[PDB]
Amino acid sequence: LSEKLLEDYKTESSLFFASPTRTILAEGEFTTVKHHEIESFPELVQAVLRNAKQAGNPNPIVVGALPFDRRKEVQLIVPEYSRISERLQLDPTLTFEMTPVPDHEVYMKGVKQGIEKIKDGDLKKIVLSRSLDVKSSGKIDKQKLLRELAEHNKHGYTFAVNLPKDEENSKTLIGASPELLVSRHGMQVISNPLAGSRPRSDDPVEDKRRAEELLSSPKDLHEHAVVVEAVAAALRPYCHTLYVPEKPSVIHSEAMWHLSTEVKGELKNPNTSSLELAIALHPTPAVCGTPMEEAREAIQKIEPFDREFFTGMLGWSDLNGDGEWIVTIRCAEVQENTLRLYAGAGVVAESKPEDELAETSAKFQTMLKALGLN
Amino acid sequence: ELSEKLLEDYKTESSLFFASPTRTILAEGEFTTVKHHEIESFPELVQAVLRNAKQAGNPNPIVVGALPFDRRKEVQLIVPEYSRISERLQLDNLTFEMTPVPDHEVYMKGVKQGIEKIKDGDLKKIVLSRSLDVKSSGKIDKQKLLRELAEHNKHGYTFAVNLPKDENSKTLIGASPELLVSRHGMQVISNPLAGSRPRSDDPVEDKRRAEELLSSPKDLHEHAVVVEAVAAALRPYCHTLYVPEKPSVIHSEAMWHLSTEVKGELKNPNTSSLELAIALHPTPAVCGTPMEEAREAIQKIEPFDREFFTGMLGWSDLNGDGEWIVTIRCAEVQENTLRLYAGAGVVAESKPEDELAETSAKFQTMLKALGLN
Numbered sequence: 081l082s083e084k085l086l087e088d089y090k091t092e093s094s095l096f097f098a099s100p101t102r103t104i105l106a107e108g109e110f111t112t113v114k115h116h117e118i119e120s121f122p123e124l125v126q127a128v129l130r131n132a133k134q135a136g137n138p139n140p141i142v143v144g145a146l147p148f149d150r151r152k153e154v155q156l157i158v159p160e161y162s163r164i165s166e167r168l169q170l171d172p173t174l175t176f177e178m179t180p181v182p183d184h185e186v187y188m189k190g191v192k193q194g195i196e197k198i199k200d201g202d203l204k205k206i207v208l209s210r211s212l213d214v215k216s217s218g219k220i221d222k223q224k225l226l227r228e229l230a231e232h233n234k235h236g237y238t239f240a241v242n243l244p245k246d247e248e249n250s251k252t253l254i255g256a257s258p259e260l261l262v263s264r265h266g267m268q269v270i271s272n273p274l275a276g277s278r279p280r281s282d283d284p285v286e287d288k289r290r291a292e293e294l295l296s297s298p299k300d301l302h303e304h305a306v307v308v309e310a311v312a313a314a315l316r317p318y319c320h321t322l323y324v325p326e327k328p329s330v331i332h333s334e335a336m337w338h339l340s341t342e343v344k345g346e347l348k349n350p351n352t353s354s355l356e357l358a359i360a361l362h363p364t365p366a367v368c369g370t371p372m373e374e375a376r377e378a379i380q381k382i383e384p385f386d387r388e389f390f391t392g393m394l395g396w397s398d399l400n401g402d403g404e405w406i407v408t409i410r411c412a413e414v415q416e417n418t419l420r421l422y423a424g425a426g427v428v429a430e431s432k433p434e435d436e437l438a439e440t441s442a443k444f445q446t447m448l449k450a451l452g453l454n
Numbered sequence: 455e456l457s458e459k460l461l462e463d464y465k466t467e468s469s470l471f472f473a474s475p476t477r478t479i480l481a482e483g484e485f486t487t488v489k490h491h492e493i494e495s496f497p498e499l500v501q502a503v504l505r506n507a508k509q510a511g512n513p514n515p516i517v518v519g520a521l522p523f524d525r526r527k528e529v530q531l532i533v534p535e536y537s538r539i540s541e542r543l544q545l546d547n548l549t550f551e552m553t554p555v556p557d558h559e560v561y562m563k564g565v566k567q568g569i570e571k572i573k574d575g576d577l578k579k580i581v582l583s584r585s586l587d588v589k590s591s592g593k594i595d596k597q598k599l600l601r602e603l604a605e606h607n608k609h610g611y612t613f614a615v616n617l618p619k620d621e622n623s624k625t626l627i628g629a630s631p632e633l634l635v636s637r638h639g640m641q642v643i644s645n646p647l648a649g650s651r652p653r654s655d656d657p658v659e660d661k662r663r664a665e666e667l668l669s670s671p672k673d674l675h676e677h678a679v680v681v682e683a684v685a686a687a688l689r690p691y692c693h694t695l696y697v698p699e700k701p702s703v704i705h706s707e708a709m710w711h712l713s714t715e716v717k718g719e720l721k722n723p724n725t726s727s728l729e730l731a732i733a734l735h736p737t738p739a740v741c742g743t744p745m746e747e748a749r750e751a752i753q754k755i756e757p758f759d760r761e762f763f764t765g766m767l768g769w770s771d772l773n774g775d776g777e778w779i780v781t782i783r784c785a786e787v788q789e790n791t792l793r794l795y796a797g798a799g800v801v802a803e804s805k806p807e808d809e810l811a812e813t814s815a816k817f818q819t820m821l822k823a824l825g826l827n
Contacts, residue, residue: 109528111499112489116535124486124506131502135495153484160491246619 081165091250094159095143098168098238106143108160118150122356129399145241145394148387172231175217182384188433190382198429205369209424216417228450229256232334237406255411258333261393263404264354267347275307275366276300276339279442291330291337304328304339307365311343314360319345335445354403367391390422410446421447456540464597466623469534470518471614473543481518483535493525497729504772507533520615520767523760545605551589562806564755572802579742583797590790602823603629611779628784631706634766636777637727642718648680648739649673649712652815664703664710677701677712680739684716687733692718708818727776740764763795783819794820
């Protein structure tokens with residue numbers, strides 16, 4: 081059935097979302113709700129979901145994507161219907177025109193600006209990113225793109241979400257993120273911050289060497305620890321007790337090794353929805369920095385493009401408050417014949433411009449491989 | 455007077471300017487936007503969203519906006535970030551290219567097809583309409599267009615609604631004479647208009663036309679049909695209705711209209727103005743009998759989409775009160791282009807040429823405001 085759901089994905093589906101706990105296909109937009117203030121959005125969403133129940137939807141969910149920038153308007157959709165199966169089980173089965181935005185040198189310049197700002201003590205952490213515009217000579221087949229991603233993403237979250245357009249052709253957010261922002265199942269809360277990276281190698285000896293190096297890198301370990309501390313501080317008020325592992329683990333996608341910690345807690349209040357928790361966490365320092373509003377102003381000033389939905393959050397939440405929200409990375413906006421791909425790299429005082437550029441390239445591979453351009 | 459200041463403060467970004475005989479509203483921003491697929495279950499969602507807006511802040515928040523002619527489309531309204539509401543208003547060179555879409559023949563072709571289908575007993579009443587694209591040499595000053603409409607519309611409903619964009623700002627602007635429905639406590643009022651004649655600058659001829667409309671059997675009969683449909687829609691919601699025996703005549707600067715004020719007293723305090731509007735929308739005055747059949751004929755014959763024209767627009771509050779108007783004598787304005795609209799009810803005994811003239815007379819409200827009267 082799960083593979084049926086992947087086969088049934090159309091550009092009028094509102095969400096495909098393949099996680100390790102399930103696969104969801106949501107069709108249509110029965111209700112869309114937009115709101116000016118992220119902080120008061122969870123209560124509006126619950127009111128909309130209650131209405132949906134009482135108007136005769138037996139399992140109302142919201143699905144969609146929220147932007148990187150918390151100050152922007154937010155929006156989610158209650159679909160007409162949704163199907164929910166077990167997780168996906170799969171055996172692997174033109175001119176393109178590239179325009180980097182910005183070019184490699186302007187990106188590196190921006191990286192020097194971030195370093196400087198930290199060396200003056202204005203910021204502790206900064207993640208700087210860049211994008212890549214791809215024009216195809218044919219119309220991109222979203223459903224095939226989605227399948228390529230799913231087949232090559234055993235452990236993360238494969239997704240497609242319909243996004244706000246003008247009435248232009250449909251705009252879809254598509255990708256394969258390794259990173260859970262938060263989930264809620266019953267009263268159990270889990271968040272999985274990822275911070276620290278090395279690219280995979282096809283040489284199995286080198287591949288393992290890089291996992292070991294990441295796992296013993298003082299700069300990466302310390303920086304990971306700081307991201308974990310911030311996730312734990314944001315979840316602590318909502319929970320009885322928090323379990324925060326003393327040691328990170330190494331996880332992988334096909335393209336990258338990542339340091340990873342699963343932070344787990346039991347809620348105090350059964351009405352605290354997964355959405356509320358996602359909003360309490362968003363954006364984590366892994367995609368933004370510390371202090372967030374300062375890292376964000378630095379980010380907004382240095383980056384010559386709008387991240388829009390990249391490094392935002394996306395997922396679903398139900399009437400009981402259960403849900404899953406992922407950090408939106410290893411992804412692309414797809415519209416007709418064009419895509420915008422995105423990638424970013426954590427920057428610190430010690431950082432080196434070329435290495436950071438190299439890291440963004442290694443991170444682009446998830447999407448480029450799905451397009452046959454790796 | 456605050457009312458006039460609200461008209462002066464109107465901006466292209468404002469979600470709603472709405473000047474009615476009971477109040478003037480200027481609504482800014484978008485605290486919450488709600489969009490829904492099924493018009494029939496929209497009222498309850500809208501109340502859910504208004505309740506939430508209260509729980510977050512002000513005691514009796516409102517929704518504002520415009521819904522389309524075609525009831526099967528997605529519908530959308532906005533709870534504004536803030537609104538000022540005052541008493542009713544008490545108010546005291548660019549070149550233009552014009553293009554009829556369709557042209558005057560294609561439109562009369564359409565009306566013939568319409569007469570044809572009523573004579574075969576498929577339809578009883580059909581409204582057919584056309585539009586008039588306009589290109590300006592400059593950017594249209596929307597605020598000034600709004601003031602012109604308001605000044606020349608003492609008795610109607612003058613509005614500017616920010617519409618879902620194409621990229622450049624899109625505004626629905628107009629001065630409608632027709633209340634679809636209001637609610638005030640348990641009191642409901644609808645004012646169907648059906649039957650018209652253009653005003654004349656010769657006051658003897660002006661009065662003659664009024665008197666002729668008021669006693670035309672064809673027009674009285676068609677008016678009584680519209681009145682029956684209003685009553686029909688309202689009956690299930692009211693313990694009592696007052697339906698006047700006969701219509702009066704009312705005027706805008708452009709037109710005489712046959713008018714009936716239908717009043718009711720609701721059974722249920724929780725019935726919102728928006729819910730009544732939906733029960734009424736669209737009336738046979740702009741669509742036809744049967745509605746589903748005549749709308750099919752309308753979609754099939756008309757070479758443009760009406761979109762918001764002959765839709766409904768207005769406001770509703772958390773208590774349930776509100777005012778919704780029939781969106782006529784209006785235009786979509788974008789940058790330096792307007793699309794003006796006008797329509798004319800068609801029956802078996804209709805004459806194609808008289809409907810073309812009737813529609814051109816209906817265009818005068820908007821044309822006059824542009825200085826093209």
